């Protein structure tokens, strides 16, 4: 969990930026099926973001 | 380690010294010609039989 | 190592002969047959083996 | 030494590599007139029909991963998330 | 071949006269130009390499 | 003892092997029923690249010479070696005598046809016992 | 005509145009090793000569050779050799049945054909009978042509 | 192509390198070649006992 | 190096390689000669049993 | 130099880099477990704008 | 000797046979292939012990052909000769150099040297017997014989015996 949270750090620094209240209710106007079809989308592309084992 | 360049001096020092090799290496599994554990064969495939009755 | 390695068993006093699966000569045309290096060196140790065994 | 079923800390995911070998030999087992538990959609090519009981999860198999300490796993494909 | 990207698969589409004929959006990965350069085709010979050499 | 492999269909069986070779795909095939006989063809013509029995017969011998990175005095210990082994066979005078009509036979511009059938002469007389002497002069002229 | 490709006019092509001629030229000897064994130009027989070729023997006249002119093509026996063989020196597969000679032909390339133009045979220095082929082929230009 | 064998069929896994010993040497060998030359004296078969004999 | 790593093999094809923008991404032409030459080892089955004999 | 110095390195199923003989070269690969297939530039937006941006 | 041993074979199987009713078939063959035959290593296998606790353990996939394999563990009654090993036996066929005794399923010969002075082998009876001083040698006759040396060579077992030394020959 050490390991994850260090290698998780930065990343989980970009989405609380990107991810602020201010953003997405000023800006982006997002509602409820947006936001977590958003949510959704990241932890899923997150998902897919990660290295196969086995490759050279 | 004899495949890259010195294959003689390499040979003939593990010859001299008893040496023993894992036979893991990727220039091993491919000189004796069968699989390798890279990508497709890093994992055995098996069966259940008790998944046939599904 | 004693079951694979030993100072007397370096000093060579027994030759193994490889086939000719590892050395092939050729017989062109019946009468142009040709033997690989290996092959006279053969040659060359029994000469000298014979020869050294008729002084001593 | 077969890690057991609440140990198993792999990944839950099927990768490409676990996809390529079971459509693979799924594929080769049904050229060889394996068992189809699928029902076909007018199918003569056996890669498509390997796909298409990927599709479904039934593919009979079970993925044995090798730990670098010597040991090993036994993730089903069908209990495999595929994708 | 100095890419992985120089050995990639391909579909046969049959078509005479003598020379590889293929699209140009593949000869920047293989570093090619249409002039004089000969090219090599491997073909399978099993099923199960076909199939993981048509997913890889 | 036996030793002698003999290619036979076994679904023909009908006479001795009337077969056809086919070098460009490495097979042997029964030219009746179609039935490949042997599959990996060996080629002669492809050992042949890398490379006289009439003449030496089945010895064999090598050459011993300077190096490029070695003494003198190793090259001669060497060669004397060979100069105390060269009573062990009486061949000597092959050599020798081929060599000395090697010249006559170059001096007389003669072609080498001469030159290898008068060889072979020499080497079908050599050393009988109805020459008994005529000081080697005779016998190569 | 994208990375350097060219597009060329069929008609022109059809009329004459960078059309060449190539001339193949086939050198083969007889010779003799210890004046027992004497290779011969002939036309083989398919009775009594092993080890012969697959390829056509129709085209060869008596004296192993063909006349200029003839249309040949790849696997196509030029100049027809044949070589003394002993019964008890080989004795390989039907050696003993064919008792006679050994085939040692010099045929055409796999992938030529031509028509050849000229044939000569001629002694060289030591007197050996030797035969020069030499066959043309128009090469029109193809796809595959560089220029 | 090959002829078909009863052995059981296995990979081939740790490989050991030694120095031949001159007693399995003499072991493993099957002639002991006597005479330098190579085919037998008919300029035929081979020499039996020789560089190559059967 | 000539033997073990890297060797000359069997079911291939060189050629000099040319553009063809009528075909697609991933195809590539394979002259008719070529097509002819090499071959495929492909299993009978139910599924194409009536092929693979009207091929024979 | 380069292929023949990394070639027995893999990634394991554990999510950390070591070669054959099991000697620990990256704990993760990419010191954060990501293939290099997936990776796009991004911008971080907490360090980016001024006091009274980052504080509006 | 009659002995019994827990045996284990490797069972290769066609991907066709990959039905439910599996099992049965891995237990067909693995008569069809044990009982009867034999092995350099245990001798002749006559009989397999507990055919309903078979275990089956897992079956593993070999890479080409697609043909599974399995490890089976059970229990088997076999039958393995020994040297210098008292048995009786039936001759069944007989030569010069000595009667062919069988002993159940194996053909054990006796050499006409290991045989005493006294018994003569008889080519002009029908069929050939060995006659002695007091005892007459045939197929049907019952013969006690000591075997001196037995052959473990793969899937082929023969053996040696004698009747030279006494409390032996016919029965
Ligand atoms: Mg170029
Ligand atoms: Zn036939």
């Given at each position: 969990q050490n390991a994850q949270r260090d290698a998780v750090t930065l990343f989980c620094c970009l989405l609380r930026s990107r991810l602020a209240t201010r953003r997405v209710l000023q800006e982006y106007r997002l509602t409820k099926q947006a936001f977590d079809w958003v949510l959704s989308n990241i932890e899923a592309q997150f998902l897919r973001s990660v290295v196969h084992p086995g490759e050279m | 380690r004899c495949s890259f360049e010195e294959t003689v001096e390499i040979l003939f020092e593990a010859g001299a010294s008893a040496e023993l090799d894992d036979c893991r290496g990727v220039s091993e599994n491919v000189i004796l010609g069968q699989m390798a554990p890279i990508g497709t064969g890093a994992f055995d495939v098996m069966i259940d039989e008790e998944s046939l009755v599904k | 190592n004693e079951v694979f390695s030993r100072p007397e068993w370096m000093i060579l006093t027994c030759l193994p002969v490889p086939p000719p699966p590892v050395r092939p000569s050729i017989s062109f045309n019946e009468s142009q047959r040709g033997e690989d290096d290996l092959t006279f060196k053969l040659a060359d140790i029994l000469k000298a083996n014979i020869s050294l065994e008729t002084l001593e | 030494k077969a890690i057991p079923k609440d140990q198993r800390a792999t990944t839950p995911?099927?990768?490409?590599?676990?996809?390529?070998?079971?459509?693979?030999?799924?594929?080769?087992?049904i050229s060889m007139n394996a068992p189809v538990f699928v029902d076909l959609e007018g199918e003569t090519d056996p890669l498509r029909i390997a796909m298409k009981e990927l599709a479904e999860k039934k593919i009979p198999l079970v993925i044995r991963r090798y730990l670098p300490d010597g040991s090993f796993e036994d993730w089903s494909v069908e209990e495999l998330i595929v994708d | 071949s100095l890419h992985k990207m120089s050995m990639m698969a391909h579909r046969v589409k049959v078509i005479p006269y003598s020379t590889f004929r293929l699209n140009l959006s593949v000869t920047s990965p293989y570093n090619a130009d249409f002039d004089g350069d000969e090219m090599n085709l491997h073909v399978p010979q099993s099923e199960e390499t076909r199939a993981e050499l048509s997913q890889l | 003892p036996n030793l002698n492999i003999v290619l036979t269909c076994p679904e023909c069986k009908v006479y001795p092997p009337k077969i056809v070779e086919r070098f460009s795909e490495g097979d042997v095939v029964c030219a009746l029923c179609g039935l490949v006989l042997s599959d990996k063809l060996v080629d002669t013509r492809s050992e042949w690249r890398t490379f006289n029995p009439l003449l030496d017969g089945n010895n064999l011998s090598t050459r011993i010479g300077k190096g490029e990175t070695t003494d003198m005095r190793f090259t001669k210990e060497?060669?004397?070696?060979?100069?105390?082994?060269?009573?062990?066979?009486?061949?000597?005078?092959?050599?020798?005598?081929?060599?000395?009509?090697?010249?006559?036979?170059?001096?007389?511009?003669?072609?080498k046809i001469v030159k290898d059938c008068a060889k072979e002469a020499y080497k079908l007389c050599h050393d009988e016992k109805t020459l008994k002497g005529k000081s080697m002069e005779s016998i190569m002229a | 005509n994208q990375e350097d490709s060219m597009i060329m006019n069929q008609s022109s092509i059809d009329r004459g145009l960078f059309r060449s001629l190539f001339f193949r030229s086939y050198m083969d000897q007889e010779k003799k090793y210890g004046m027992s064994i004497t290779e011969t130009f002939e036309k083989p027989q398919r009775t009594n000569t092993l080890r012969m070729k697959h390829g056509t023997y129709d085209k060869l006249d008596d004296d192993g050779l063909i006349a200029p002119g003839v249309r040949v093509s790849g696997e196509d026996v030029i100049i027809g050799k044949t070589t003394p063989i002993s019964p008890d020196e080989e004795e390989l597969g039907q050696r003993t049945a064919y008792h006679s000679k050994r085939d040692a032909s010099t045929p055409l390339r796999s992938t030529e054909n031509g028509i050849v133009d000229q044939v000569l045979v001629t002694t060289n220095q030591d007197g050996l009978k030797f035969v020069k082929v030499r066959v043309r082929t128009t090469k029109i230009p193809q796809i595959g042509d560089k220029f | 192509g090959q002829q078909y064998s009863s052995a059981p069929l296995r990979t081939v896994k740790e490989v050991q390198f030694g120095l031949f010993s001159p007693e399995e040497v003499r072991a493993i060998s099957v002639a002991k070649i006597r005479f330098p030359e190579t085919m037998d004296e008919t300029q035929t078969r081979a020499k039996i006992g020789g560089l190559n004999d059967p | 190096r000539g033997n073990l790593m890297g060797k000359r093999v069997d079911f291939s094809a060189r050629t000099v390689i040319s553009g063809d923008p009528n075909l697609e991404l991933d195809q590539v032409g394979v002259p008719k000669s070529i097509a002819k030459t090499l071959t495929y080892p492909e299993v009978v089955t139910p599924y194409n049993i009536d092929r693979l004999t009207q091929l024979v | 130099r380069l292929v023949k110095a990394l070639e027995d390195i893999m990634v394991h199923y554990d999510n950390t880099t070591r070669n054959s003989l099991g000697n620990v070269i990256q704990f993760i690969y990419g010191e954060d477990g990501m293939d290099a297939a997936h990776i796009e530039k991004q911008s971080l937006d907490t360090i980016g704008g001024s006091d009274a941006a980052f504080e509006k | 000797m009659f002995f019994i041993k827990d045996l284990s074979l490797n069972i290769t199987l066609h991907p066709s046979f990959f039905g439910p009713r599996m099992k049965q078939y891995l237990k067909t063959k693995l008569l069809e292939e044990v009982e009867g035959s034999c092995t350099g290593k245990f001798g002749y296998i006559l009989c397999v012990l507990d055919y309903d606790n078979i275990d089956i353990q897992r079956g593993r996939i070999l890479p080409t052909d697609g043909s599974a394999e399995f490890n089976v563990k059970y229990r088997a009654v076999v039958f393995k000769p020994f040297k210098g090993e008292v048995v009786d036996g039936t001759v069944v066929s007989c030569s010069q150099h000595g009667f062919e005794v069988q002993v159940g399923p194996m053909k054990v010969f006796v050499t006409k040297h290991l045989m005493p002075q006294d018994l003569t082998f008889n080519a002009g009876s029908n069929p050939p017997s060995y006659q002695s001083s007091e005892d007459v040698i045939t197929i049907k006759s019952r013969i006690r014989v000591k075997i001196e040396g037995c052959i473990s060579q793969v899937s082929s077992i023969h053996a040696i015996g004698s009747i030279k030394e006494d409390y032996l020959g016919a029965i």
């Open positions: - | - | - | 995911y099927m990768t490409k590599y676990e996809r390529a070998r079971i459509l693979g030999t799924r594929a080769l087992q | - | 060497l060669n004397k070696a060979q100069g105390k082994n060269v009573m062990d066979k009486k061949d000597n005078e092959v050599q020798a005598a081929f060599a000395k009509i090697t010249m006559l036979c170059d001096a007389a511009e003669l072609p | - | - | - | - | -």
